[PDB]
Amino acid sequence: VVGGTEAQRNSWPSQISLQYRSGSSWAHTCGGTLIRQNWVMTAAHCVDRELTFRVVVGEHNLNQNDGTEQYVGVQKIVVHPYWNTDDVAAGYDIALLRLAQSVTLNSYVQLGVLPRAGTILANNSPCYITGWGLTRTNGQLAQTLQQAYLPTVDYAICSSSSYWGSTVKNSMVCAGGDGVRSGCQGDSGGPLHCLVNGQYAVHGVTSFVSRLGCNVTRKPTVFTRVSAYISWINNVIASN
Ligand SMILES: [Ca+2]
């Protein structure tokens, strides 16, 4: 997250860190949202390499054991069957991970709230991105979870030639684009939390930024629109 601040500790309790094993070590690669006690929602592009993955819930500082974390392996990976690794702009950047154990819910570990199927937010709706991604273009992962305010940019504006044009589809949500705040590498897969009727819900799964850099004016961060995938999500959980 570029242009953000450190989140209050455990204040986004559905946020997970997705990590892969590198020799004897684990490394953060992406975010995700806990949606059931044994299911996490993330981006397809985060899990379509053949690595060993684990999920960390209740995480805040990636480099110290805080005592709120629970560490669990990934038993099954369900990528959307229409995802194409070579064409992030075609969409379908979503996957569900079935965890090896159910996590224990508590103050620090909660299920994320998803929107009802097909919900669309008005332009400039209030949302926050969270994650441990780079805190500058070509910089360093954050040690502590970051948040930044990133208001929505509706489909008509975002797909205009002044923004992303035809790179963005209506199965995506765009947010930010101010040139200061944005998602960045290592935030992918994680949530965009948007305020609806006083409650935050996870309306996006972080998918991509410009090749020119993370915080680029009129290139908002682009997210998979969760509300376009509610039927798919429930189908996968019901049948897996
Ligand atoms: Ca920690």
From Swiss-Prot:
Pancreas. Basal layers of the epidermis, hair follicle and sebaceous gland epithelia (at protein level). Its EC number is 3.4.21.36. One of its GO terms (biological process) is proteolysis. It comes from the Eukaryota. GO terms for cellular component: extracellular space. Its main location: secreted. Its cofactor is Ca(2+). It catalyses: Hydrolysis of proteins, including elastin. Preferential cleavage: Ala-|-Xaa. SMART domains: Tryp_SPc. Belongs to the peptidase S1 family. Elastase subfamily. This is Chymotrypsin-like elastase family member 1. It comes from Sus scrofa (Pig). The lineage of its organism: Eukaryota, Metazoa, Chordata, Craniata, Vertebrata.
